[PDB]
């Protein structure tokens, strides 16, 4: 009984795309009874590791905390949201790849820096300025000299 | 590449029992290379996506913010509130149908433009004049002309 | 207690310029304790006539009902708020000028349209569409023709 | 010309009461020619001007919008919230000082840049990068070179 509108058991499937670099399956189902079509998300029953914050406190992985940081650094940058979601899926993929119960907050940060360098070099400097907490304006020139390698 | 352990593309499926009172599909998957087994949960996304506003800020979907815009354009028009609620439910339905975490504010606008075109063509012009921010009176005539060619056919 | 920052009772006055062609008095006041400068507008509270609505019901004059209708028509338009307030003050001035107990809602609407024609011609069409309740899309072309030829 | 009925310049004042907590001055004026007595209300102009956005659209002044921008630039900076509120009150003060019904969004941004230069020079660069929408990493070096002369 997959239909949520008329509550009919059989629901025919139309499409089956692979989103999130293979982490989940998006399907385009439609019920035979009513003329209503909807989307479904088949995801694997595994957990993203816990985050080991700067103050050694463990916290559940929140992809929105990760995303918001990136969007603040990308403020007026011409980087599409599909590229951002691709970078977020790749960082999650690499976090899963460790096979650890928990990952430090510093590891997530470095993986974002790794994506932002590819996405936008201005946005990368904006992120590093707060991520690495710049205490002098000279820290900006040092990150640029580091990036012109 | 559905495998989460070794990252192999092809993942064979073994079982498929409908669980959660038919609301979701619990399946058993097995990798072909690492030979591990895991559980899958296919659920319908029925939550309303976030709105990516004109200033790139994300905002929760507010059906009242959608309805007010329509009622301003539908001022003094003979379109009943049951037709308005039907149009609002159809726009929400189409927004759910995308299967997205967030939809742009522009997508919502285009969807109410097609509903208002069906509901009231005077109300549609009123909405389009602010939605598309008309800067000249000639823009009004252009929207009417690029409407009368459709009715002609 | 005229000071709004430190809440001191005595507030000394330095300047007094008559603004709005005598309709109000601008004055600079500077607190004695916090020493900060601010403006105070002395304006007259006058009687505005009652509004005889489309359904012949009388209603007190509403400067916000008047302003909101204009701002709905003036959506996304580049017309400054000083020009808007000038237009609203001129309509109120003309309403008072009749010297009548009550004015019809139709009189208010015509006066608003006279101001919107000067302010923004796109906004004028938006207002006229709801004000004159357009029943066909051809009503839009008629209002545009009614301005392009006879100014 | 304070008289609104006959339009006479000189208007004699008779009374001078106060709006509760001295927030306003009620007056009872009388014309010398038409001899009419009307009421006056002198109140402090504390409402903030409208913001003329980058796309010439007018918007009400939103303190949260102004403050949020500063707090994003002042992330992890040792600038206390009392200094931030002082800078926000000084920008609002300068906005009322113009005596205009509306101020451009660009003027607000320059006044924030003026405060952030005093508050934190790292935070000033962070604000300048988005405010002046940097399109190249070289824009950062240019803003720093501008600052190192003084
Ligand atoms: N719970 C979380 N889930 C996912 N990403 C997180 C989470 N907490 C932090 N992050 C991300 O980790 C990266 C680095 O974190 P950061 O360097 O800020 O350290 P922290 O110890 O989490 O402290 P804070 O967030 O207060 O700075 C950033 O991209 C941030 O958005
Ligand atoms: N949070 C929201 N939830 C639902 N509908 C919304 C929301 N925000 C805006 N809308 C609707 O989206 C459509 C188009 O929005 P619009 O073109 O106005 O752009 P915007 O970027 O949201 O800016 P604004 O609302 O200031 O015009 C309108 O029907 C509007 O009512
Ligand atoms: N009480 C009021 N005070 C001031 N202006 C008013 C008042 N009521 C209506 N107006 C204004 O009068 C103008 C014309 O009014 P309108 O043509 O809308 O007629 P109405 O009989 O008031 O009906 P409705 O407001 O329902 O349309 C508009 O600018 C409107 O904002
Ligand atoms: N309505 C508002 N009230 C108060 N401050 C505002 C308002 N809108 C913008 N600001 C502030 O004005 C300053 C400069 O604005 P900005 O340069 O961003 O231009 P804008 O035309 O408002 O466009 P944007 O949407 O990109 O901010 C910033 O400090 C911003 O926070
Ligand atoms: N204003 C900003 N400009 C550019 N990058 C920013 C800005 N604010 C945050 N970031 C980036 C770099 C930060 O290290 C990263 C994460 O932001 P941060 O405030 O540390 O919170 P967080 O996402 O770790 O969550 P929390 O504060 O709850 O621990 O986002
Ligand atoms: N006066 C009006 N006449 C006709 N249609 C209008 C009018 N005002 C708004 N609309 C229509 C077109 C607009 O693009 C749409 C949405 O209203 P708008 O004022 O833009 O705010 P919104 O609901 O999109 O977001 P927000 O609440 O964040 O401003 O409604
Ligand atoms: N969507 C709109 N677009 C443009 N102008 C509008 C819009 N809605 C209203 N107006 C303008 C033209 C209308 O004749 C005028 C008055 O608005 P209306 O909703 O009739 O209320 P009102 O101000 O007369 O109060 P009330 O309806 O309570 O009597 O405002
Ligand atoms: N991530 C950031 N790091 C540093 N400064 C920032 C950041 N984001 C914004 N700012 C500063 C500089 C911007 O010009 C200023 C205002 O932000 P902006 O996104 O332009 O919106 P705003 O406050 O003008 O409102 P809106 O865009 O909704 O009209 O705040
Ligand atoms: Zn069904
Ligand atoms: Zn495997
Ligand atoms: Zn923004
Ligand atoms: Zn109404
Ligand atoms: Zn004081
Ligand atoms: Zn609005
Ligand atoms: Zn008609
Ligand atoms: Zn007199
Ligand atoms: Zn924080």
CB within 8 Å of C144: residues ≥ 6 apart: B137, B140, B141, C125
Would residue A1 count as lying in a domain? no
Residues C29 and C98 in one domain: no
Measure the CA–CA gap between B110 and B136, rounded to whole angstroms.
Answer: 21
Residues B29 and B54 in one domain: no
Q: What backbone phi and psi angles, to 5 degrees, belong to C32?
A: -85, -25
Are B26 and A2 contacting, i.e. CB atoms less than 8 angstroms apart? no
Residues A101 and A28 in one domain: no
In total, how many domains does chain A have? 2
Would residue D3 count as lying in a domain? no
C and A make contact (3+ CB pairs below 8 Å): no
Residues D23 and D65 in one domain: no
> Are the beta carbons of B129 and C126 separated by less than 8 Å?
yes
Are A123 and A134 contacting, i.e. CB atoms less than 8 angstroms apart? no
Residues D101 and D28 in one domain: no
Which atom of ligand 7 approaches the CA of C65 most closely?
23
Q: Which residue of chain B has the CA closest to A98?
A: B5
Residues D71 and D134 in one domain: yes
Identify the burial level of A73 via C-beta atoms within 10 angstroms of its C-beta, where 0-12 means exposed, 13-18 middle and 19 or more buried: buried
Would residue A97 count as lying in a domain? yes
Would residue B113 count as lying in a domain? yes
Residues B39 and B58 in one domain: no
Are A94 and B4 contacting, i.e. CB atoms less than 8 angstroms apart? no
Query: CA-based angle B127:B128:B134, to the nearest 5?
Result: 120
- Is the torsion defined by CA of D80, D85, D90, D95 positive or negative? positive
Would residue B78 count as lying in a domain? yes
3-state class (DSSP) for residue A110: helix
Measure the CA–CA gap between B135 and C77, rounded to whole angstroms.
Answer: 8
Chain-centroid distance of CA B94 in Å reads 4
3-state class (DSSP) for residue A40: strand
Q: % helix / strand / coil in chain B, to the nearest 5?
A: 45, 20, 35
Spatial CA neighbour of D93 closest among C7, C4, C11? C4
Residues B24 and B99 in one domain: no
Chain-centroid distance of CA D66 in Å reads 11
The distance of B61 to chain A (nearest Cα, Å) reads 17
Measure the CA–CA gap between A12 and D4, rounded to whole angstroms.
Answer: 77
Residues B37 and B88 in one domain: no
Would residue A81 count as lying in a domain? yes
Residues C54 and C103 in one domain: yes
H or E, element range at A51: strand A50-52
Which residue do the tokens 């113009």 mark?
A: D98
Find the domain containing A15 and state its range.
11-43
**Protein residues whose CB sits closer than 6 Å to any atom of ligand 6:** B 65, 69, 72-73, 126-127, 130-131; C 72, 75
Residues B17 and B39 in one domain: yes
Resolution, given in Å to one decimal, reads 3.1
- Is the torsion defined by CA of A91, A94, A99, A100 positive or negative? negative
Are D44 and C4 contacting, i.e. CB atoms less than 8 angstroms apart? yes
Token pair for D105: 């969004």
3-state class (DSSP) for residue D73: helix
CB within 8 Å of C92: residues ≥ 6 apart: C48, C63
Residues B26 and B64 in one domain: no
Would residue C17 count as lying in a domain? yes
Would residue B1 count as lying in a domain? no
**Which chains are adjacent to chain B, needing at least 3 Cβ pairs under 8 Å?**
A, C
Other CB atoms within 10 Å distance of the CB of residue D32: 12
Of D9, D21, D96, the CB nearest to C1: D21
């Amino acid at each position: 009984m997959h239909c949520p509108f008329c509550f009919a058991v059989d629901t025919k499937v139309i499409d089956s795309r692979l989103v999130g670099e293979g982490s989940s399956v998006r399907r385009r189902r439609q019920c035979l009874v009513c003329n209503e079509r909807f989307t479904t998300f088949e995801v694997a029953e595994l957990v993203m590791p816990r985050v080991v914050k700067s103050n050694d406190v463990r916290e559940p992985f929140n992809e929105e905390k990760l995303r918001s940081g990136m969007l603040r650094a990308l403020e007026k940058r011409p980087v599409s949201s599909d590229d951002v979601e691709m970078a977020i899926n790749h960082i999650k993929s690499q976090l899963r790849a460790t096979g650890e119960r928990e990952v430090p907050s510093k590891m997530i940060g470095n993986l974002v820096m790794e994506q932002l360098k590819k996405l936008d070099k201005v946005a990368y400097i904006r992120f590093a300025s707060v991520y690495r907490s710049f205490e002098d304006i000279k820290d900006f020139g040092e990150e640029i000299a580091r990036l012109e390698d």
